Amino acid sequence: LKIAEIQLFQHDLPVVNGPYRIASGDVWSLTTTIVKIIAEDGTIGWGETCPVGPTYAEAHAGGALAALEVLASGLAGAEALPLPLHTRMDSLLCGHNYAKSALDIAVHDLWGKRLGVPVHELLGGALTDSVSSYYSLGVMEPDEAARQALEKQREGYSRLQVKLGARPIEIDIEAIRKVWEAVRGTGIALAADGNRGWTTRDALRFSRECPDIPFVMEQPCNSFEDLEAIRPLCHHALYMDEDGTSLNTVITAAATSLVDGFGMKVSRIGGLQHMRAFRDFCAARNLPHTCDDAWGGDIVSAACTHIASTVLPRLMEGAWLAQPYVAEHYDAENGVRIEGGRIRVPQGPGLGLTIDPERFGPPLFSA
């Protein structure tokens, strides 16, 4: 089955209860980029990519659109299968995983609709009908973080990510301690996310002062080299997030045993094809990981949920979704949502979405 046409759209998503505060930069609203692939038989597949602001990673909305124009321009006539798609995409544009991801998601949607099976089947088969999620607390005053921590634990979340940084480390330590005192005993898993915001000096301190607090340190420092620096000097587990920019890079990290796990985003790694290989890699190495993306609506969230359902539950640290912060569903009936801290896995063909072909207005670009 061949790609006949590709259409590109953008749409705004304002942060409900915003802003969402991250040490690398806060977000109040997001411009998502939507891909529709149309097959020669008229069937469609949807894809999406939505950077969380322009400073979180090497990605932005205008960049997604520009890269997708290049990719779309060379894709008519290509087979709508993941390996042929990626081979063609790599021949048109180097890098830009986050743009490539949107086309990859759309191909998986189209493929599943063609064969009449859910994307999770195409990814090897779901191991579960519902997946755990985790809640991310933005950088905030310690007492409020403690208050929300308990609130989200009572709502059913199995894991809590505490965002830190962009302020003195004293306050970050105060925050993690207060959150811990609020939720200790509940068995909820704890991640301290520095979002590249800490010098090695302060990362060493954070771990050294808190041996009694069972957080994992998620991307505390700004580079792969700084993770290597602190690894032999921190007795807490270390997780890579922002630095995991390719399958190659994660292979370097986990075979050198630099980290004990990953925050992983579908768009950063280049789509479900590479996310599936990443999952298989982590399973082989017994390394827990999340199944996230940067931001987005129903399309992104469906993609993450489908991949998350194929991960051994003990290794799946949770699928984080932007859903609670997004005031819209592209598909009000079937769009995934967090319920009791968990997410029900879609069972329809493809991503499990029915979205009107003209939902996102006239195309910004067609090829």
Added chain:
Amino acid sequence: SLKIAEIQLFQHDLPVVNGPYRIASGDVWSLTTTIVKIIAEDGTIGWGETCPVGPTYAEAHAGGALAALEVLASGLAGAEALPLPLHTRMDSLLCGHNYAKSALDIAVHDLWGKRLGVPVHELLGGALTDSVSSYYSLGVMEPDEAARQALEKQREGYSRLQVKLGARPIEIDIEAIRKVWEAVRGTGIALAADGNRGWTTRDALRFSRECPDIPFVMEQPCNSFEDLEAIRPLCHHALYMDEDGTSLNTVITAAATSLVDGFGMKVSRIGGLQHMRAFRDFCAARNLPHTCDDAWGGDIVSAACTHIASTVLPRLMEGAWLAQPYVAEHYDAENGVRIEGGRIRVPQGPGLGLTIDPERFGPPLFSA
């Protein structure tokens, strides 16, 4: 959610045409293959196969295949016929025994493709090519004769030659590789020197040191992972792992430490197509060439290897070796894959692309 309703096991002898096939770790005259038939609840069937290359090549043998498949089969009825649910269930029934698990994995991919009406290569992500390269394996033999066969095989169209060495003085192995190279230099054919675990580090160092002018890769020259690590910083020839690549975990250790420049990879050793496709993706990310082989087998094994090989970037695919030229019979005489002009046409039918008579292998040895 199509479930497995019944599993049947069989064994069948495959005598080596023009045998024996000579390896440093153990010669082979005839091989016992183990066949799995998975019957789904709608009566659709999937075939799988595993056939160790004698009992001394690797930690695997025909009797062991059957015994492990009995344990796996006994706990598999009612399982979903999808790769991840299958492997999760299999791992809950029996630790290790990748070569046995591989047969069930292949059968599940066959059944899955038939249910969906698509070839196994589609299920593995999509073929990049309609035909794949192969390589010829010259057994350990007299040097001038190795050279004569090497040229014959090059002229048949093989893109790559594997020269089997070992179980004799290193002097002779060096003589062989030089005679072979003299015969084919200038044809551009790729060259692998396979020590088949047979060299001490002493002799491996010598083999590389004496032949900088011969562009072989050294395939599994020594007996262990540690010995590969020993010679790696002291050999200026590329090094490939084969026998030591016993799990996804192990190959990840090897390639991210850059111990090797490539792999001979066998579907059964890695535990089936599910793991082989992850391995493929790992090699693609690392730009590491690899083969797509298995130990031995008939049409079922050979189809499995051809399907995965079709999904590899041709510049990284060192060839799919098949036992086909050494196997007198085809299970499916019409659709069974075969080597023609040193290459292999990729099957396009649903599943593995085979139709095998349900009673081809006689009554089941075991059913569960």
Added chain:
Amino acid sequence: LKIAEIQLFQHDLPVVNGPYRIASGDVWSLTTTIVKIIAEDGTIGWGETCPVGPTYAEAHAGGALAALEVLASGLAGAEALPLPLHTRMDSLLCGHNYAKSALDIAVHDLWGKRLGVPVHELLGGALTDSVSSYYSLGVMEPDEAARQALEKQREGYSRLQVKLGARPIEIDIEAIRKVWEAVRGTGIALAADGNRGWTTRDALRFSRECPDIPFVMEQPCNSFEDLEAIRPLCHHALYMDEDGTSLNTVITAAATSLVDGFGMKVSRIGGLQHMRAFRDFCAARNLPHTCDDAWGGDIVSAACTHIASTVLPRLMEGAWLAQPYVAEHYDAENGVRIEGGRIRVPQGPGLGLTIDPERFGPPLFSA
């Protein structure tokens, strides 16, 4: 003296007060595989191998029988001595140490009977007339683990292994702490056996939270690579168990100083010939080790007791026997047993057992 005939049998050993709980898979009852070697003069030697279920290690009862069939089929005519035996066995079948072990044990039994000396003499000579043992606590409720631990210390065991895993690490930590509370001050040695069940994340936490508890961490993680990962980050001693699958691998581990000691099983290493080499390696390196096997009756237990008797007591962490969990003795008079937490070493020829040749019924296979 040459081997004239080999006979194979299987026998079921139901777990007394079962099941025995392991993170890698629990056990309710076990099929043991018995080897009888008949020499050309009619003298017999017995051997045995019994995996602890099919998921603990790469070994199962059906695999033992299948491998022993191949080995037995090429063994008539071989000298009944350890090196000629292993040389012939390696020419017939690659690997399968647990099967090869049964034939090795039988050869040592036969050899000792021919020469009129105990197996411990053939292994270099016993250093003691009784050996220490250790008790293995299955995964259980922390308070009950603590109660059983004190009870076993009071029986006279010099060491306790606490099995952990297949549940949240919080509970494993609660268990080790409560066990320690119960037995501290008695000087009983403590092992915390993760049985390959912990991610590196959780292994780091287990050590980090408990510097005050003198456990060794026995095989906390699933691979050699994960042991390498946590080694520079845990201040507790690390022991290898399941990963010690050959003399080659042990040499890698202990000369890189990856571990401070070993759980070692006779079947995993391939028999008494390799176990005595292993013992000599540990003595040269001052590394303590156990002298165990997976499971089995009188034959396995005799083998473990004989090798254990030749180890310097300060390095011998104990010989664990399945005996207390096995209802029946093959030789009720001479079969070894744990008394006051210790085991009296047999002094008769060979393994020190006399088993009726028809004890296990007719042979399943003869060659």
Added chain:
Amino acid sequence: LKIAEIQLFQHDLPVVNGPYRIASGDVWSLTTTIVKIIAEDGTIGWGETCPVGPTYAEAHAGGALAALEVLASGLAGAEALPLPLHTRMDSLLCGHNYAKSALDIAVHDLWGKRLGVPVHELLGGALTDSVSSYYSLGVMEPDEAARQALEKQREGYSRLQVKLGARPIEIDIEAIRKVWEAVRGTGIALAADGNRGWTTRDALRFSRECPDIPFVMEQPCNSFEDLEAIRPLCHHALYMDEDGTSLNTVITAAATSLVDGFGMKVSRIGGLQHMRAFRDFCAARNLPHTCDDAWGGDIVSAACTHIASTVLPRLMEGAWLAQPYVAEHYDAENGVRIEGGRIRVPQGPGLGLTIDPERFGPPLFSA
């Protein structure tokens, strides 16, 4: 002096007598992206960035424009100095060095015009009035490469880069051998550029077969990890080019002594501010390097020539310019050009260019 306005333009540059063949992908024509910064007093500075096709690196013309739109939109009121500029740019957009480079170049042009001094003075002071260059031979038949090598050597180039790859390694070896047979005896420097195109297998072979040929191996393989893999196994010097994506990564490479030198592009490292730091790092480490960019007209070429003039000549491997492949000059009088294999350094204020404010037509974007 503050920035009052930023204008963005694009312009076509067809490869004179192309294509220019690279393993990572050939080029027939390039779209350049031009920046004009206007200060509050009306003085202007010009900048430029022109990726060499979309597959050479993680950069493309559409991406340059999209990123520059984001950057320009937040730069009004910023001080026209390198550190204030980069600090502001980094607060607006993560990464995208190739886009940031264009604004950096425009800032240096403006700054030099305000102070009445050449950019090379602002960079610390030129050490020479003319700089060496090197000629890059595209991938071509070995016989043709050898003849072109001979012609360029006789023309006066001090160094030749031979582009290789995207074909059997046998042909690359034939090519470097013939080039060597042509230029041995002339003293010209030789670089063999694999352009990320070789597996480690083939890179090992290329070096092993040619110890008598004094090439440096420039970026033979596809990743930093692959350079690390071959480094202890190749007796030829190794240079990094494509992998040198930030000052951070260069520091990792040269302090671990992974490489003996660099091909460095101004746009990849993020502009003249970072190129100057890179220059100082190479001087401290005694590591030779080029002063190139990916492609471009007079603006890019001026920037490269200015930085190149400040490098110790013995460490300056040459400033490669796209000029011979570019039909037009933005400033026909003052635009730099290669003559006798060398480049005369401009001496006017700023970059030393006068370009009509309307040369590129109406702005595509203004902020």
Added chain:
Amino acid sequence: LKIAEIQLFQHDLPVVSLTTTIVKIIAEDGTIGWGETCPVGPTYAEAHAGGALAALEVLASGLAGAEALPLPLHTRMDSLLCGHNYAKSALDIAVHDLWGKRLGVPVHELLGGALTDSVSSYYSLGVMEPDEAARQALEKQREGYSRLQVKLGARPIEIDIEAIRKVWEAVRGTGIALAADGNRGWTTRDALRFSRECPDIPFVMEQPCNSFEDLEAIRPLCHHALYMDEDGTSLNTVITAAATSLVDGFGMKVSRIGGLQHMRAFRDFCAARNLPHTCDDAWGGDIVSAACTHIASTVLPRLMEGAWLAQPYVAEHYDAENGVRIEGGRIRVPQGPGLGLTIDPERFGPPLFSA
């Protein structure tokens, strides 16, 4: 069976003399076992005849009542004296002799079972003029030796290189294995040169330099195999060397490693790691040579680089009938009980020392 008495003797072994030290262990039933240790003079290793005797007096004085088995023996010996492996080796050999005699089986059976009835040997060429070495090399190849060790050093590296090239030219085509033994005599500077100039000559470099550290220095810079000899002073050190893959093989001496009990462990270690090794000792008569031959017979022949014996340089036998000897470059393995020797209890005269 307990040790009742231990007697020590010294004897001047005439050459074709060196002071050998003989141990007789007498069991309580009157059964005797013979052991021996004989350093090659005082400068080759940290060992000498006077030291052997002094250490053996200490060991003998605390051994009455000990069990005549290898592990009880070594446990008691280590409790009486630290190190002195070469002295301990003599008692270890005597214990194995006595044990085999008691059970009526050869030492090779007690060591796990012989894999062959005859073992390969190798010839050691002393440091000599290059043309002479080449002439003798061919001579010894034609006698049937499967391996040739060329001793080098104590002179300019230029001449060592000339010597190895001339030897190789003389014997290439015969398949004889070649070892270049630097005898700790080369600086790393010269060891690097020796390998670098000779990639075409298939020697292994046996102990080229003076320390373990120097072997570590040259290992990543030499494309020739490296063997350890003199530095292999304990099982512990061997484990360090071979698991770090510092070397590709060993020259190993029974006395240096502390006797047959430790040599057997070393053999098993090399078999696990696929590392070839010799089975030698420093010097000695029939007792030392029997011990080496028994352990050598239990090694996989492909891994056994040869048992070197002092026998052709020793002008007498303790047991002329059963003493091992090299014939056609190989050694027939003894088959009688113990070491396979019958030596008169009064052969060496009255004890120098008894305990």
